[PDB]
Amino acid sequence: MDLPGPIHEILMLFGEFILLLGGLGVVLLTNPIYSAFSLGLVLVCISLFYFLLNSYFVAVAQLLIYVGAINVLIIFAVMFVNGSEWSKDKNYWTIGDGFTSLVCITFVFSLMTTIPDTSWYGILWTTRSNQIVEQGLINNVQQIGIHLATDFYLPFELISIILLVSLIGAITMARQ
Amino acid sequence: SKLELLKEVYGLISILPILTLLLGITIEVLVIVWLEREISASIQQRIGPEYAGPLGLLQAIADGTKLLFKEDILPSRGDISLFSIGPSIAVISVLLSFLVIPLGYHFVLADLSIGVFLWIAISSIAPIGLLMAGYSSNNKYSFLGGLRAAAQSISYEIPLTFCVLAISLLSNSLSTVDIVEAQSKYGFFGWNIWRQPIGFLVFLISSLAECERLPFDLPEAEEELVAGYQTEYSGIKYGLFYLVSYLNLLVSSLFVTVLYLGGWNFSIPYISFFDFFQMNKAVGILEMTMGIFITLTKAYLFLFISITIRWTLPRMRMDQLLNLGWKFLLPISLGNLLLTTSFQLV
Amino acid sequence: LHEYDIFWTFLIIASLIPILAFSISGLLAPVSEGPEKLSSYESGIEPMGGAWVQFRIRYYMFALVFVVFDVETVFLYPWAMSFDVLGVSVFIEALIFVLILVVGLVYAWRKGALEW
Amino acid sequence: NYRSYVDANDGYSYLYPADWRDFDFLGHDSAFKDRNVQLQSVRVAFIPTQKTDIRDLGPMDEAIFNLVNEVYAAPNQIPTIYEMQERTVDGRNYWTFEYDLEAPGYGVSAFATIAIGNGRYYTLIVTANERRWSRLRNKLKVVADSFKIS
Amino acid sequence: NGSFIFPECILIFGLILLLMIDSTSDQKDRPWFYFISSTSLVISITALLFRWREEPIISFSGNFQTNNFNEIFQFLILLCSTLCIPLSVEYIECTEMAITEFLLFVLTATLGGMFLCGANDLITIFVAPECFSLCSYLLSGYTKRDLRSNEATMKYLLMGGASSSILVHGFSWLYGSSGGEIELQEIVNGLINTQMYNSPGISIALISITVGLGFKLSPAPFHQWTPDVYEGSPTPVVAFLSVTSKVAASASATRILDIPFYFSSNEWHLLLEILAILSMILGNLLAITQTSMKRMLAYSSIGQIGYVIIGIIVGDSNDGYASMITYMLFYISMNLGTFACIVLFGLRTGTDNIRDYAGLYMKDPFLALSLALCLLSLGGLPPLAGFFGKLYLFWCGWQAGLYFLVSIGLLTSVLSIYYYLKIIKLLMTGRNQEITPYVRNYRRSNSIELSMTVCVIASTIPGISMNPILAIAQDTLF
Amino acid sequence: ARAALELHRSLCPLLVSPRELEFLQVRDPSFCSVSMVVTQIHYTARFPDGTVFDSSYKRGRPLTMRIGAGKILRGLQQGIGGGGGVTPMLVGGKRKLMIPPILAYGPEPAGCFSEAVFAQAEMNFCALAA
Amino acid sequence: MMFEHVLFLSVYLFSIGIYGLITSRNMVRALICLELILNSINLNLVTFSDLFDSRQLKGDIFAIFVIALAAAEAAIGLSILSSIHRNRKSTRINQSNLLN
Amino acid sequence: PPGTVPRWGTRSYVRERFFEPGLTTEEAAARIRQTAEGMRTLRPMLETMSWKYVLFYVRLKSKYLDLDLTTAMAGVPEPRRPEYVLVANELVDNMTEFDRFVRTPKVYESYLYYEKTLKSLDDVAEFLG
């Protein structure tokens, strides 16, 4: 499987520009429900990023377990925080806004200059046997299907009790 | 030379079949609303939408065109920031599901080995749009009117999943075409609805509330406040909501028949329709139209069953609906899988 | 799993559909309705004001138990696909998996969580 | 076993037993697969390779091993080559052989065949899951015992 | 199909039984499960007794671990839980809270900690810290009607989410740069056939891992979350955390930093040092000014004492790990003793602040003595155990060249003597008109007594009987 | 980055025997073979003529890899686990290799803002198991 | 620019995810930003498991586990939010420093 | 047998071609000849269906040989060089079709061009030097 052609980078840039505005809406808007809806938009436009790259399961699942359950749960939660419409006008809060918008940008600069010095397209040639197998005849719901249970046995056996404990704790806490 | 791209300017995609599907689904929406307005209000009543020509064959698109103008109002509290954004998610959640739905022998739009999984994933995006729409305004009768439906919808996808999986484990696939492949063996013995009727019951009862049936229990009783979160939505907005409702109904019927029944299989196995004559000449258009034929009728049967059930039970209140969806359907929809595990153990 | 180009074209077309319909409605529409237009309907009282209408106490438990019990399915799907491909070990593994959450559901049932 | 399809590609003409929902896997021009189980029967793929009859690619037991262990394999597998046989039905010198690819869990099997006639080295294959490979082996060999060209 | 999880399969069995009994039984549980859980714990300890003197055999498809050194910590966490449960039974008993799911939470957290001690998988060593952290925001807030127990859930959940985030981002950077690899042993291969090792990148995936590690065991620059939570949560879970969290984190850190980081030694040996030199300073100064007992314990016994453990991880040529094992074995006891004494006195009176421990020597002298012993041991005085702990930690660590870490350690130990002797002085007094009417009404007087008395003599005897412990701790190669 | 310093000897071998794919050479076979499992070797890699760019001795424990599943240079996996026409190396064995540039990284380097391996190189090894 | 332009957006989200975390005032916004950071790391993870490691997927499984644990944490945090809003009748985060 | 010359890899394809501007004649003559012995290594990876590298490598080597072939050919013998331009058409249409027959993975056409794509590239570089 593969992609159409030079239409690729078009959708890439489009989704990137959508996701940037989505994140800015998540972090800027004061009305929390608008923030949650913009978060849902961010997550669907990142599910589309997952789907563009030929990884299908980790896209559709991510769309089902987040753009579904988690967002409606958060919407239900925002029905418990009262009092909105705080101050505004260019870092509404204290100087902590400026201090953050400084340190975060330093973090950016660091990682964003570390990355464009590693030849990723050269780190792909040195591994020409990893993605050269495909097991002989497999599709990409059986790859995960088997390789989840043939060697990832212990964490799969583990996650269930984590889920159960989280359920029990959530019910015991939320209930008065 | 080949400066940027020779054959890759725009000539790799055609938008003919997609528009054909659009025309077909719109026509089928007209057919199903005609079915409703001519059978539901005609059991012991007068005829349905007469005077719109011979019969209401033009009445449906007439209501569509009327709703088209209807001066969309856009109330003050809440605006285009979320108002126009609301029904878009609703309509797309069911429109995109038409991808993996087949219609006949080699008429699928995309193989998409994660097909039914994609359908289940896209079925659980509507509640987001419903909550958004119901909250796009400010007053009540839309906030709680949408909250009720968005909440009760969440209480049913789990039986949907534990009935779709009890068929995926039988067909050993996730693409509809392979599902109907594993079902065209014995004509109608091999049909999964007989092999797993306990799952079909759960799927059918869940499908009702999953496509908002019923959203209001009575022709006089409202959709639990004054209306189902579509009060201020006057023109094309209520039109799109009417659409998305009918389309959820359609997709549910098509999926239950393509899963538990032979998709485009006759009552005699689908391959057997060729061998007993020793030769075929022009079976192409015959099999195409007969795949549209033998499939759409099976879903029509469920359309009619739902239409009848509409006038036989008082749809429960959302004090009993949650109880039924949680403490009744979940245990049996788990037990059928627990059974079919050892059943498919061989 | 060969060509999702039809999927992408259907995505862009069906995403243009709603904005196309909205714009078509807007073109041939009335530039009118400068009336009150600040109150929604089925409230002939011309009412206004109010908040704290939540009742989240009940539905929040339903939302939580659903969010927790959902993760079962996206783990079962890779198992539900790989039953015959692999042997019968995955059968016992997934049985342990599902039985854990069956016990969890039994607990949520006994202690009052799923209520009116 | 029962059906006999040239598959109209002007080349091969081989057999396939039963219903065989007729997938399109990646080896183009033909494929066939069962319903209940996975990892099923014939697929065939073409290549251009302008050499002559297969006997030119080297000795049988060595040219067979340089691809049953380097191409039809994966670094996360162990291959095992069983019996191998020439055919010479029209001087094409086919190479039919049955091998196994054991994996962490899979353990698939195969009855590969090869030709070199005017179609330049296009090959066949069959397979089934190991838990049931024993009960239908002789049903699949007659499948491989069909490959001729035109 | 494997017995290397049976030490944890027994724990899972006990977990399922504890969950079942509340579903089926009516009211016969309160003193019943109180020992039924101890049965599961002691049976798991007996199961781990078998695998003494075993092979480095690799796990299920090579997933978590099975060697000698890892088995030591696997048993040590069980020891902590066995000593801790009797404390966290009666405390929550005298709060009218449901007790079943509390013991369930403690058991599941112990299970996560036990699995973490191995986990050479890069994914198991990610889920297991969550299996240990997801069962931590519950306990650390499991008194809902209180107010402080909510602050020590907000400023614990936010922090433990951010830190695990940073850690997993470092893991993703490593998985990327490593040409694609998870198995902990098989990284220095894969980071070579992909020649991107000596390049920037790895230098980032080292810091983004070390920071997430530090937060879990709280050295100075990231200690911020510890002093608050330890005051806001109930004292038994404070003790449980302050023992098993540190044990599990220090068991995971040495393996995650020694196996896949051969080359970067000279660039993380320094790094950890910068933490230690701060951890044993900022965790002591504040400890002086404290007036609450739990918060002072957070500062001293954790903010600092997580210093000299690390004080050899940097200076380790496999001749030191024995000293880390010995110091951990000393610290567990010399910390659980004082926590048992604090739980007992707090329950018997109803106060936490220091100014109420006056006169306690006259009312009940046994408890005052068994608390003074553990406190002095924490101080590190010659005949006790903490002295020999710190000693063998320095003697191997001065024997490894580095000098500007042992001197600071001794100096901050001298400094730490202050508040220990302060509370000790507050014990011994007889000025009747000074003691508040808290110790004045103290009806002096099973489980907590047994735990406190069998945990305090292990804070005096092993410091003099460390010969077999030392002979045992030398066989660690990991 | 690029080459750095080191120092060692080589224990001069006999003449290499190419065996039609690579350059093989044996120094000392001692104890026993190794299956498709984790191994632990000590290497010292050269350039074609003289230069040395890495050596397991330049770190602590000699690195540990997988001999039997493709996770390493095809040349090595052919010359350590035993390739077609070559006997595998024993537990305490010791061999010397000259890797042709087809069984190696091939005709493209591994860049890090400066290729750490000369583009289209063919290197040498002195591999001693342990 | 597939393999290169996406990673250039990982940081450009991760950073934001931290900032909204720090400057957050209400609990639900802090939880939203936490989820956002986890999704950032998820995205930074998946692409690595598509360029290489296609024989045995080692990233997609890890992505699945990350999403599962994210859902669990988002459940537990909101559950705690219920109890705090029960105790005090407002969830202003930065106005509770009685533990210092 | 000493070391070699890296010769401008070194970047992340956003530093190169976007931010480190430089390309001299007879230097593109290195990239052109390099993608000939370069693209002649996918034959084993076309034997086994590794449909995920036969796209990335082709995209990269193309977007590299879609600018050099426009710079290098300006610097060949300019008196007589219509053929050195009557080859770029072939050497960039054969590859433009190669990129088609890998998107929807075929085998016959993919391999029938994976020979008639390198057979040409040995002639574009031929007119250079």
From TrEMBL, chain A:
Entry keywords, A to Z: Chloroplast, Membrane, NAD, NADP, Plastid, Plastoquinone, Quinone, Thylakoid, Translocase, Transmembrane, Transmembrane helix, Transport
Topology relative to the membrane: Multi-pass membrane protein
Function: NDH shuttles electrons from NAD(P)H:plastoquinone, via FMN and iron-sulfur (Fe-S) centers, to quinones in the photosynthetic chain and possibly in a chloroplast respiratory chain. The immediate electron acceptor for the enzyme in this species is believed to be plastoquinone. Couples the redox reaction to proton translocation, and thus conserves the redox energy in a proton gradient.
Protein name as annotated: NAD(P)H-quinone oxidoreductase subunit 6, chloroplastic
Family per similarity comment: Belongs to the complex I subunit 6 family.
A cellular component term, taken from the record's GO annotations: chloroplast thylakoid membrane
Enzyme class: translocase
GO molecular function: NADH dehydrogenase (ubiquinone) activity; quinone binding
PANTHER family: NAD(P)H-QUINONE OXIDOREDUCTASE SUBUNIT 6, CHLOROPLASTIC (PTHR48479:SF1)
Lineage, broadest ranks: Eukaryota, Viridiplantae, Streptophyta, Embryophyta, Tracheophyta
EC number: 7.1.1.-
Organism name: Hordeum vulgare subsp. spontaneum (Wild barley)
Subunit composition and interactions: NDH is composed of at least 16 different subunits, 5 of which are encoded in the nucleus.
Cellular location(s): Plastid, Chloroplast thylakoid membrane
Superkingdom as given in the UniProt entry: Eukaryota
Automatic annotation (TrEMBL), chain C:
Top-level taxon: Eukaryota
InterPro entries registered for this protein in UniProt: NAD(P)H_OxRDtase_bac/plastid, NADH_UbQ/plastoQ_OxRdtase_su3, NDAH_ubi_oxred_su3_sf
Localization, UniProt: Mitochondrion membrane; Plastid, Chloroplast thylakoid membrane
Transmembrane segments: 9-31, 59-80, 86-109
Enzyme class, spelled out: translocase
Coiled coil: none
Bilayer disposition of the protein: Multi-pass membrane protein
Gene3D superfamilies (alphabetical): NADH:ubiquinone/plastoquinone oxidoreductase, chain 3
Main subcellular location: mitochondrion
One Gene Ontology term of the molecular function aspect: quinone binding
Keywords: Chloroplast, Membrane, NAD, NADP, Plastid, Plastoquinone, Quinone, Thylakoid, Translocase, Transmembrane, Transmembrane helix, Transport
Catalyzed chemical reaction(s): a plastoquinone + NADH + (n+1) H(+)(in) = a plastoquinol + NAD(+) + n H(+)(out); a plastoquinone + NADPH + (n+1) H(+)(in) = a plastoquinol + NADP(+) + n H(+)(out); a ubiquinone + NADH + 5 H(+)(in) = a ubiquinol + NAD(+) + 4 H(+)(out)
Any one GO CC term of the record: chloroplast thylakoid membrane
EC number: 7.1.1.-
One biological process term in Gene Ontology: photosynthesis, light reaction
Protein family according to the UniProt entry: Belongs to the complex I subunit 3 family.
Subunit structure: NDH is composed of at least 16 different subunits, 5 of which are encoded in the nucleus.
Full protein name: NAD(P)H-quinone oxidoreductase subunit 3, chloroplastic
Source organism (scientific name): Hordeum vulgare subsp. spontaneum
Automatic annotation (TrEMBL), chain E:
First-tier enzyme category under EC: translocase
Assembly with partners or alone: NDH is composed of at least 16 different subunits, 5 of which are encoded in the nucleus.
Domain NADH:quinone oxidoreductase/Mrp antiporter transmembrane: 119-416
Family: Belongs to the complex I subunit 2 family.
TM annotation in the entry: 1-20, 32-52, 72-92, 99-116, 154-176, 196-215, 268-289, 296-315, 321-345, 366-388, 400-421
Coiled coil stretches, renumbered: none
Main location: membrane
Reaction(s) the record says it catalyses: a plastoquinone + NADH + (n+1) H(+)(in) = a plastoquinol + NAD(+) + n H(+)(out); a plastoquinone + NADPH + (n+1) H(+)(in) = a plastoquinol + NADP(+) + n H(+)(out)
GO biological process, one term: ATP synthesis coupled electron transport
Cited InterPro entries: NADH-Q_OxRdtase_suN/2, ND/Mrp_TM, Ndh2_N
GO CC annotations, alphabetized: chloroplast thylakoid membrane
Domain of life of the organism encoding this protein: Eukaryota
Recorded name of the encoding gene: ndhB
Location in the cell: Membrane; Plastid, Chloroplast thylakoid membrane
Keywords linked to the UniProt accession: Chloroplast, Membrane, NAD, NADP, Plastid, Plastoquinone, Quinone, Thylakoid, Translocase, Transmembrane, Transmembrane helix, Transport
Name of the protein in question: NAD(P)H-quinone oxidoreductase subunit 2, chloroplastic
Membrane association type: Multi-pass membrane protein
Enzyme Commission identifier(s): 7.1.1.-
Start and end residues of each NAD(P)H-quinone oxidoreductase subunit 2 N-terminal domain: 1-90
Automatic annotation (TrEMBL), chain G:
GO cellular component, one term: chloroplast thylakoid membrane
Reactions the enzyme catalyzes: a plastoquinone + NADPH + (n+1) H(+)(in) = a plastoquinol + NADP(+) + n H(+)(out); a plastoquinone + NADH + (n+1) H(+)(in) = a plastoquinol + NAD(+) + n H(+)(out)
Recorded GO MF terms: oxidoreductase activity, acting on NAD(P)H, quinone or similar compound as acceptor; quinone binding
InterPro entries noted in UniProt: NADH_UbQ_OxRdtase_chain4L/K, NUOK/Mnh_C1-like
Entry's Gene Ontology BP terms: ATP synthesis coupled electron transport; photosynthesis, light reaction
Chain ranges passing through the membrane: 6-23, 30-49, 61-84
Annotated compartments: Membrane; Plastid, Chloroplast thylakoid membrane
Record keywords, A-Z: Chloroplast, Membrane, NAD, NADP, Plastid, Plastoquinone, Quinone, Thylakoid, Translocase, Transmembrane, Transmembrane helix, Transport
Top-level division of the source organism's lineage: Eukaryota
Entry's EC annotation: 7.1.1.-
Membrane topology classification: Multi-pass membrane protein
Record-linked HAMAP family: NDH1_NuoK
PANTHER family listed in its UniProt record: NADH-UBIQUINONE OXIDOREDUCTASE CHAIN 4L, NADH-UBIQUINONE OXIDOREDUCTASE SUBUNIT ND4L
UniProt function note: NDH shuttles electrons from NAD(P)H:plastoquinone, via FMN and iron-sulfur (Fe-S) centers, to quinones in the photosynthetic chain and possibly in a chloroplast respiratory chain. The immediate electron acceptor for the enzyme in this species is believed to be plastoquinone. Couples the redox reaction to proton translocation, and thus conserves the redox energy in a proton gradient.
Subunit structure: NDH is composed of at least 16 different subunits, 5 of which are encoded in the nucleus.
Gene (name only): ndhE
